[PDB]
Amino acid sequence: IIKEFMRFKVRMEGSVNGHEFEIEGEGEGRPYEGFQTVKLKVTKGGPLPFAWDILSPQSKAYVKHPADIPDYLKLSFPEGFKWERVMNFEDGGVVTVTQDSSLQDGEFIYKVKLRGTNFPSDGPVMQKKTMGMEASSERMYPEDGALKGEDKLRLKLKDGGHYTSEVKTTYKAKKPVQLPGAYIVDIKLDITSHNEDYTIVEQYERAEGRHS
């Protein structure tokens, strides 16, 4: 069902500090090799009056797993999985995300709903002072019959130093599938291209699981 090459289609409905938008995208990659690319367009409420980098992390079927760590999110398909995310930014900004992943007609289908609130109007998010994020290591652990990740995402500030978020995510297969033990996923998300007002953006992600 999950081929060595897979396309996906994504739709996001979102608001950030009350600004409503829609995003449509098309992605592709090699699920077993742990890389993928995606192209997004802001179809409604563009240009976005806030930093793209808060939306960049909103595709876990494309993580490279060694043979001895069960690839829980791949084993969910074809029915697929849901994920729920809370991002607690250092200046009090909050992002909540829910996501449905499924497999239709040989491609992944992603539906995302996002709410950001409480970003300071003078902060780096509403003032677009971020230039992408550092590589991260998401700590994965099973709990309550689901897979959980925690990370600390480090957004790059133009003038030097970082703007940080605590991120907790829950990934749950729609049908009981084998959960792994606790492990680590090294991730690098790159914005590879964008038009001037970030209404069109291209992103490259690499993700590899490994033991602690």
Side-chain angles (χ1 to χ4, degrees), residues 2-8 10 12-212:
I2 303 188
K3 310 305 185 192
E4 293 196 74
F5 178 90
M6 289 300 285
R7 287 193 184 85
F8 76 78
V10 60
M12 173 188 281
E13 310 189 345
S15 64
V16 163
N17 270 25
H19 182 93
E20 288 164 0
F21 63 88
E22 303 203 1
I23 294 164
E24 284 170 37
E26 290 192 356
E28 77 172 43
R30 298 196 56 93
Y32 300 96
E33 286 202 74
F35 68 83
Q36 61 186 307
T37 66
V38 62
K39 185 176 195 189
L40 288 333
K41 189 149 179 174
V42 180
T43 52
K44 320 193 173 152
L48 299 175
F50 58 83
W52 178 259
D53 292 314
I54 71 169
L55 306 181
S56 69
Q58 326 310 340
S59 187
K60 286 307 199 188
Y62 297 82
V63 176
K64 181 174 181 167
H65 283 72
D68 63 321
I69 305 183
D71 202 330
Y72 173 72
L73 298 182
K74 277 190 183 70
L75 295 163
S76 74
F77 289 98
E79 299 90 347
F81 70 97
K82 291 179 188 293
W83 58 265
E84 300 214 344
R85 181 165 294 154
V86 181
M87 303 170 85
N88 288 320
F89 292 83
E90 69 176 70
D91 60 352
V94 187
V95 170
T96 57
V97 204
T98 54
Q99 203 270 10
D100 185 86
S101 312
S102 68
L103 207 162
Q104 302 177 210
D105 218 9
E107 295 185 353
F108 301 115
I109 302 308
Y110 298 155
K111 312 194 249 299
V112 197
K113 307 184 145 178
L114 177 147
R115 186 132 103 95
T117 71
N118 263 281
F119 289 97
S121 294
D122 59 338
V125 164
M126 302 314 290
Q127 295 298 129
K128 288 176 49 163
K129 294 290 172 210
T130 63
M131 291 196 323
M133 41 181 340
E134 300 292 354
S136 72
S137 289
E138 192 171 338
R139 177 184 64 112
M140 315 306 293
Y141 61 96
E143 173 172 275
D144 190 14
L147 178 65
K148 318 277 194 91
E150 307 176 2
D151 208 348
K152 186 191 293 194
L153 289 201
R154 295 189 305 123
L155 286 191
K156 284 183 236 187
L157 287 175
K158 302 215 354 92
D159 295 292
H162 296 88
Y163 174 67
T164 71
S165 191
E166 308 259 270
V167 183
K168 295 186 212 297
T169 310
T170 294
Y171 315 83
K172 196 192 179 19
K174 293 169 182 172
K175 58 176 196 210
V177 164
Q178 175 64 60
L179 286 162
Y183 74 106
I184 305 273
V185 180
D186 303 303
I187 302 156
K188 183 141 222 314
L189 196 168
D190 311 303
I191 307 303
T192 56
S193 150
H194 64 86
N195 61 8
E196 168 87 300
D197 64 349
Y198 280 77
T199 49
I200 305 164
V201 186
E202 294 190 33
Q203 315 200 143
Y204 185 58
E205 195 223 44
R206 293 166 280 192
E208 185 166 353
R210 75 179 156 77
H211 291 283
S212 316

